[PDB]
Every structure is written in structure tokens, then in C-alpha cells.
Design a protein around this ligand. Structure first.
Ligand code: NDP
Ligand code: NDP
Lengths: 398, 400
């Protein structure tokens, strides 16, 4: 049915999307797969989904993939490099592009898909956190359909009216009866720990997700709620929402994935299991649905559902991100970059848990750079913020 | 500007819907108001909204109203009788019809609107509980748009995809990725009560609705869960759902009003305040939105949200309703009727709380007439079931 190009096929999101196509072989055809260096995984994916093209970023990995596929008898054409990755995202025949490449490396490929007016299954966070302005403008000009894959943004999308779903980003919320967007989050493992003790929390304590384990980096972001701050930035761009049209709410059980408040008092919400196949399948099948392999949510086996307002004294990173948005893309990409450095430094036990927020603010207070005007400017800000951050860490550890 | 006729304007749903009109005078204009005998209320509504027509089912009430509006310089023309009520629902210029007349009455006025291809703001249980097949077949023929205002059905509607909303009753769930409809209910005040004590519960105890206070009759139906049973029958007709596509869930806090499960695992739900102005406003502005005067729900002042599966030993009436549906409109009509009689008998302390489900079942078992073909047929089944019910109550409240 629909032809897709998967950017970052060997990662977690890429594997989950391939599982969805595996559940619906007659509705989806994989024409191109793009990854980085995981040759072993790529081979298996190429051998199962018969893509016309397979692209590795690393030139060496590509050569290795090539000999592997030939030994296995596959005729999948192998390519290498960023340009090749962008070409796959712009293939004339592809309908959808699952944008799951992490970091700055996902920027150009995602943009190429946007400029080609493809339906974009957006998973890449950096896209809007650092290039929100540039990308939403690009989506408007090409008329590409953005479909948020991230759990929260996807739930919000599903809870939004039809006119906004179509023409996403440049549609008026107020004009479609939407009062605000309710962004939910678990609050992390330190939701009730004495503020006094936050400074002594260990990486292992911080990496225990209150509901289900994830990557260490993301787990820490969930403990500081920087993750929710980043999603706040994305949501603003994605749904064309002002500050007053955004509400952040702690929901410990993570059963409700996010909601939308309406003018008549109605609140629409999306609930489900903690399985990325659900959001992914929603975007791939939109406006229809398909089986994702996810089991039906059992309402009789749930913990009581609760809510609470986030305390900025406990989650300074959340407030930091909200303020950064109002300061511009330079501030948001800098915050994002600084956080990658400080979280990494926390996990490497170079700084304390509470130093993440402190150092993130310190880096931002030293930037004072102009608004990026292109992906190159963003990259420049990113590189600059990381150096400042690495220096901040080093002076702290010494 | 939307032109509307309000069937049963002086009631609770009627006043709430008129309050939505106040908040949006530039979006809605009242053309006709229909009521029964509350002349006092009608006067104020007529003076405030200046309807072109006003009608009272009661001949006398209408007479009095006609003179009061005249002496108070009102241009609204007063009519009377059911025929007039039905005409108001079919006025050519009318766009929407708030079907808020309760009981057997209102069946014909709501059908009139349906046959006229109007947009029906359905706020009347009898329509689908007793005339499910008849009304749904009729909406399919005339292409009338049904918009449920009842809290649960409205929540389900808002949580359904667009293709189903625009072809309500016609479109099928599976094709649109819907696996089931989750109908939620509070469970009543006897949710935790020891099963053996139910027989000694008094009217005052059964009439304590868990969250928001309400009518005695409906409070009792909430305690036996007959209310949810009746809603189950309506939902299957309204959303074209099979038994396996229906799920009944107890949700004590009643914050979530109902939900819908999707093929990919997604569950969509509608939450809000108990205020009926929300659902009413939703249907009136659909596919758009309008301010209803209802303040946003504060998620920080909520009780923990819980869910549970209904135990049929505790809620026999829920099960009776589900079984009645498989038997047709004759059985659902008779069940509804019997329940009116038994609940009223319970309130009058002629029978025990547990005698409601017991007698409801008993009247169903004695019913013979099968599947009505027109509303007149269901009216006949209704009348017959009421009589059988009354005799069962008298037999039990004298002999047994
Ligand atoms: N994990 C989750 O639950 C969610 C993730 N997201 C976001 O969406 C994205 C999904 O990444 P995720 O799957 O989680 O994790 P991974 O980091 O494991 O996936 C990243 C993928 O991108 C590939 N890649 C890395 N660098 C390059 C490059 N330079 N050129 C081309 N491909 C490259 C990797 O290939 P290889 O491994 O072969 O090197 C891998 O397939 C992230 O940006 C994440 O923040 C959003 C919501 C949820
Ligand atoms: N209450 C609620 O929250 C909800 C109710 N519903 C359903 O919708 C309907 C709404 O009734 P509700 O407003 O609650 O309560 P009421 O019984 O107070 O309202 C009924 C209305 O119908 C009028 N009426 C009664 N008999 C006749 C008749 N023979 N001819 C014309 N008009 C007549 C009444 O007029 P008058 O008083 O002047 O005689 C009154 O305006 C009910 O069937 C109910 O089951 C659905 C969802 C919610």
C-alpha cells in the first residue's frame, strides 16, 4: 500500500515501526532503510523487508553491509553518506518517512523529507527543539503532513479536531475550539523525595523510571523533567500554541498520555499501554487504524490515576525550558546541547544530579547569541553550547 | 446562525440548553419551544428568547400562556397538543432540534424531527431504548444527523472518528478501526454494600447518587445499574455495536464520561465536569466548538480515578438489559416499562430494593408480544408491560 523510507531503522523506534509493517505486510512496503553503523541489524532488516535501498552513514559499515547482503544473495542496493540519507527521504515514490534518526544527524534528512512534501512520521526530537521555526516554515511551504510519533505529542494529536490534524502547525487552536494542550509526565523517580536529598541522588536511582525502564539519558531527563521541558518546546511549535495554551501536569501512572482542553469544558485524552507501536501505528495508518500488536489496556489492572502540578523548585529544568522557548531557537538548542553534556557528566559521576539544572542555566546565561537562520546556524550554536558546558563541568569537577 | 426547536424547554436539559444560547446569541436563534404544563417557566423563556412559536401539550396551559404573552406584548404564537409539538420538530426553517421530552411522549415529536431530516440533539432515552431499530432505520432513510447529548453517549461520540460521527448508525466500527466502546458508570451508592444487605436498602439510601445529586428515579437506576443497562441498549443502536464491541466499566469518580478502544491499542476518552451544558454545547456547535459557561476541570482537585468490572450478582438489572437487547424492541420496551413501575413502587416503599430486578425479570418472562413495527406498536407493548408490572407489585405487596 504505502511506500515508506525509515530514517534510523536499526534503533528502537525503527525496529518498532518495522514490527508494525510486519503486522501489516499488505498495507506497507519498505522501499528504503537508513541507519548508522549497526550492520548486523541492517542485514536482518534488509533480508526481511526487501527494501530497494539500504543506507549506512558510515562509509565502512556500508562496504561491510554490501558484502554481507551479497553473501546472503540480496540485491538491495547499498549507499552511504548523509546525502544518500537525504535522497531516500525525498524518493519520488515514497509516501511516508519515519524520521527516527537521533541527534543533529537527523536534521538534514528530515528537512529533505519535509521539502519533498512527504508525510512525516516525526520521532526526531532535535527537529523541533532546535529547528522548530525553520521546520514549521518548511512544512507550510511544501504542505507536508507532520504526524507526531512521540507518545505525548501523538496523544495530543489524536485528541485534536480534524481541521488541526490536517494543516498541523499553521492552524488556529482558538478558532477550532481548543483552549489548551495538557502535556502529561510521570514526574520521575524523585517526585516525592525530600528536596534536600536531590543533591545526593545517584545515577542508578535516577535511571529507575517510575513505571518502565528506558535509556539512561532519557531516564535522567524524566527525573529532572527536562524531557517534559523539551516536549513543551516541541508542542508549542507543533500545535501552534502560545504559553497560555500550554499546561504541564504530573500524572505518575502514565496511563493517560496527554490531553486537550476544549471551549465547552470537554477534555479529550488518549490512554494506552507504554508501547511505542501504538503511536507509531497511529501515524502510519492515519486517518485510519491498523493492528499494532499492542495488547488492549486492561482498566481493571490499573493503579489509581492521579494528577499534580509540577513544582519548579523540584523541576528547575522544566521552567528553564519554558523560559528558553520565549528567548528563541538559540536558547532552546543551547539548552538541549548543554543538557546532553551535563546529563552525560552526571552519569559519568563527574557532577551531582542537581548540577544538571544548575549547569544548564549557567551555560544559557553565557550564550547571548543571535537567532539561527538555517540548519548551519543551529549546528553552530549547538557546538558552542557543548563546549561551554564541557568547560562548566570541568571547573566543577576540579 | 443556527435555528432551533427545543422539545421540552422547561425541563433541566431544556434550561441548560437555553443557557448555552445565552452565551452564544449570535450563533443560535430559538424558533420554537415545546413543553407540557410549566406555564411559569415558558413565560420567561418566551420573553427572553422571543420564539416564533411556543406550544404546551396541555390544552389549558396553552390557553393561559397565549394570554400572558399577549398581555406582555409577545409576538410568539401559542399552539397546543402533540400534533403541534411534532410540527415544531419538522419546521422547514429549523436546523437543530433539542429532543428533551422524556418518556413515551416525545417519541413522536422526536421521530417527526428525524423524518424531516433535521439534526437531532438526542437527549431522550425512550427513543433508542424502546424504538432503537425503528428510529435508526428512519435516520438512515432521511439522513438526519443524530448527536447524543446524554453524557456517556456524547463522550463516546466525541471519542469516535469523523467518518462514524457523520454517519452515526450507518457506518461500522471495525472498518474504522474501533474494536469496542467502553461505557462507564459510577456503580451507585451500593458499590461496596454486602450483597445480603441490598434487600434492606431504603429509598433514601438508594437515592444518594455517588457524585452529583439527581432525580430519585434516575438515582435508583444508578444504584441497580439499570441506567447503564439502558445506556447499553442505546449505545448498540446508536453506534451500531455488537455485544463483543461493548464493554461496561464501573468508574466511581465519574470524571471520565466514557471511552472507545482502537485497533492499535489507543483508547480515546472524554473527561469533564458533571455539567450537562458541556455535552449540550458540543452537539449544538458540532463540528465546531462554543463556550458553555462551564469552567475547565481542575485536574489538581480530583479524587484518584479507579475502574472495576460490574458483578451481575450485584447488578442483575444490567445483565437483564443486555439480555433484553438480544430479544428485540419488545423486550427492551417491556423492561424499560416494568422498571418505571417497579422503581416507583420501591420509592413508595411497596417493595424491596432487590424486588426491582426480581419483578423486572418476572414481567419480562410473562411478556409474549414480539417485535413492534411502528411506534404505536411499542406504545402498546409499553402499556401492556406496565399493567403486568403493576399486578406483580400488587401481588407481592399483599401476598408475598
Ligand atoms: N525511544 C523512544 O521511546 C522515543 C524516541 N524519540 C526520539 O526519536 C528518535 C528515535 O531514536 P531511538 O530509536 O529511540 O534510539 P537510537 O539512538 O537507538 O536510534 C537512532 C537511529 O539513528 C541511526 N543513526 C545515528 N546516527 C546516524 C547518522 N548520522 N545517520 C543516519 N542514521 C544515524 C542509528 O543507527 P545505528 O544504531 O545503526 O548506528 C539508529 O538506527 C530520537 O531522536 C528520540 O529522541 C521520541 C519518542 C520516543
Ligand atoms: N437530566 C439529565 O441530566 C439528563 C436527562 N436525559 C434524558 O433526556 C430527557 C430530559 O428530561 P429532563 O430535562 O432531565 O427532565 P424533566 O422531566 O424536567 O424534562 C422533561 C420536559 O419535557 C416536557 N414534557 C413532559 N411531557 C410532555 C408532553 N407530553 N408533551 C410535551 N412536553 C412534555 C416537560 O414540560 P413541563 O415540565 O412543562 O411539563 C419538560 O420540559 C429525559 O428523557 C432524560 O431521561 C439525558 C441526559 C441527561
Amino acid at each position: 500500500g504505502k511506500q515508506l523510507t525509515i530514517l534510523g531503522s536499526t534503533g528502537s523506534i525503527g525496529c518498532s515501526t518495522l514490527d508494525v509493517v510486519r503486522h501489516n505486510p499488505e498495507h506497507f512496503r519498505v522501499v528504503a532503510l537508513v541507519a548508522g553503523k549497526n550492520v548486523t541489524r541492517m542485514v536482518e532488516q534488509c533480508l526481511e523487508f526487501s527494501p530497494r535501498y539500504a543506507v549506512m552513514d558510515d562509509e565502512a559499515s556500508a562496504k561491510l553491509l554490501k558484502t554481507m547482503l551479497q553473501q546472503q544473495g540480496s540485491r538491495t542496493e547499498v549507499l552511504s553518506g548523509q546525502q544518500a540519507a537525504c535522497d531516500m527521504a525525498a524518493l519520488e515514490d515514497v509516501d511516508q518517512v519515519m524520521a527516527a534518526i537521533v541527534g543533529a544527524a537527523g536534521l538534514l534528512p528530515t528537512l529533505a523529507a519535509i521539502r519533498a512534501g512527504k508525510t512525516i512520521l516525526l520521532a526526531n526530537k532535535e527537529s523541533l527543539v532546535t529547528c522548530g521555526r525553520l521546520f514549521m516554515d518548511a512544512v507550510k511551504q511544501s504542505k507536508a503532513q507532520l504526524l507526531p510519533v512521540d507518545s505525548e505529542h501523538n496523544a495530543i494529536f489524536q485528541s485534536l479536531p480534524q481541521p488541526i490534524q490536517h494543516n498541523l502547525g499553521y492552524a488556529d487552536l482558538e478558532q477550532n475550539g481548543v483552549v489548551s494542550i495538557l502535556l502529561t509526565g510521570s514526574g520521575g523517580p524523585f517526585r516525592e523525595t525530600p528536596l534536600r536529598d536531590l543533591a545526593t541522588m545517584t545515577p542508578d536511582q535516577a535511571c529507575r523510571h517510575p513505571n518502565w525502564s528506558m535509556g539512561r539519558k532519557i531516564s535522567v531527563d524524566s527525573a529532572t523533567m527536562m524531557n517534559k521541558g523539551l516536549e513543551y518546546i516541541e508542542a508549542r511549535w507543533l500545535f501552534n500554541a502560545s504559553a497560555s495554551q500550554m499546561e504541564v501536569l504530573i500524572h505518575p501512572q502514565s496511563v493517560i498520555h496527554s490531553m486537550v482542553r476544549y471551549q465547552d469544558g470537554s477534555v479529550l485524552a488518549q490512554l494506552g499501554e507504554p508501547d511505542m507501536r501504538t503511536p507509531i501505528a497511529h501515524t502510519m495508518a492515519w486517518p485510519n487504524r491498523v493492528n499494532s500488536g499492542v495488547k488492549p489496556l486492561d482498566f481493571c489492572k490499573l493503579s489509581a490515576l492521579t494528577f499534580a502540578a509540577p513544582d519548579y523548585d523540584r523541576y528547575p529544568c522544566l521552567k528553564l525550558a519554558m523560559e528558553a522557548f520565549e528567548q528563541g531557537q538559540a536558547a532552546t538548542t543551547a539548552l538541549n546541547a548543554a543538557n546532553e553534556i551535563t546529563v552525560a557528566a552526571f552519569l559519568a559521576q563527574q557532577i551531582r544530579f542537581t548540577d544538571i539544572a544548575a549547569l544548564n542555566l549557567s551555560v544559557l546565561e553565557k550564550m547571548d547569541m543571535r537567532e539561527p537562520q538555517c540548519v548551519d546556524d543551529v549546528l553552530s550554536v549547538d557546538a558552542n553550547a557543548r563546549e561551554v558546558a564541557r568547560k562548566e563541568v570541568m571547573r566543577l569537577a576540579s
